[PDB]
Design a protein around this ligand. Sequence first.
Ligand SMILES: Nc1nc2c(ncn2[C@@H]2O[C@H](COP(=O)(O)OP(=O)(O)CP(=O)(O)O)[C@@H](O)[C@H]2O)c(=O)[nH]1
Ligand SMILES: [Cl-]
Ligand SMILES: [Mg+2]
Lengths: 35, 177
Amino acid sequence: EISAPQNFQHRVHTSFDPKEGKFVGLPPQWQNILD
Amino acid sequence: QTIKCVVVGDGAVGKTCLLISYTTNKFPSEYVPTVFDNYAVTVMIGGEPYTLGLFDTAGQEDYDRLRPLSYPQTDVFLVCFSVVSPSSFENVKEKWVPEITHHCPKTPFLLVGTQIDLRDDPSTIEKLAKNKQKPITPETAEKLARDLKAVKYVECSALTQKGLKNVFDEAILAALE
Ligand SMILES: Nc1nc2c(ncn2[C@@H]2O[C@H](COP(=O)(O)OP(=O)(O)CP(=O)(O)O)[C@@H](O)[C@H]2O)c(=O)[nH]1
Ligand SMILES: [Cl-]
Ligand SMILES: [Mg+2]
């Protein structure tokens, strides 16, 4: 059988930050397209 | 080793709630659209632990150029639609399967129907009826899965958790197969 999932980790959270007016918390491969 | 599982599908389809409900057994109390989120859990199959990497993508078209940058070395896709959103069902054929095929031609995917608890809801059956439409049945979903040409069709409710673990258990088996 397959166990229920364990040890939850939220590793990447990307959002647009309107104060700075740019995406933040980007994946690295998105970064070298957008930054 | 690590299983890479990528979740795609139209906005409002319920991809974030699907993932948070399964990984945490909590239902998000707010709607907040996704740009990109990466979560990890550990699962054990037959005594062997695996990290399941879960890629939560944006269903909004604004991210068409950016979203797929996350598709390299995907082991399995979940292609999602809401059983009470016919337009989301159409886009499976028109947008989503074509997209993941193009980027990952030899990668398996599952067709996932979400929000099944809303099929028998009078006031979502009403909203659909005001524009002369109705929920998607499993019979219809399953034909599309056969034709299009998925591993299989599974459905669930993030809210009630009916069928939810099964979706990911089949995703895991598809990736390891
Ligand atoms: N009743 C019910 N509502 C759900 C279910 N899953 C999600 N929702 C609701 O539907 C809405 C959309 O959920 P969300 O998980 O944010 O969808 P999404 O596909 O991630 C949207 P985006 O593509 O922008 O990230 C939310 O209001 C949420 O509460 C479900 O199984 N049942
Ligand atoms: Cl693997
Ligand atoms: Mg989301």
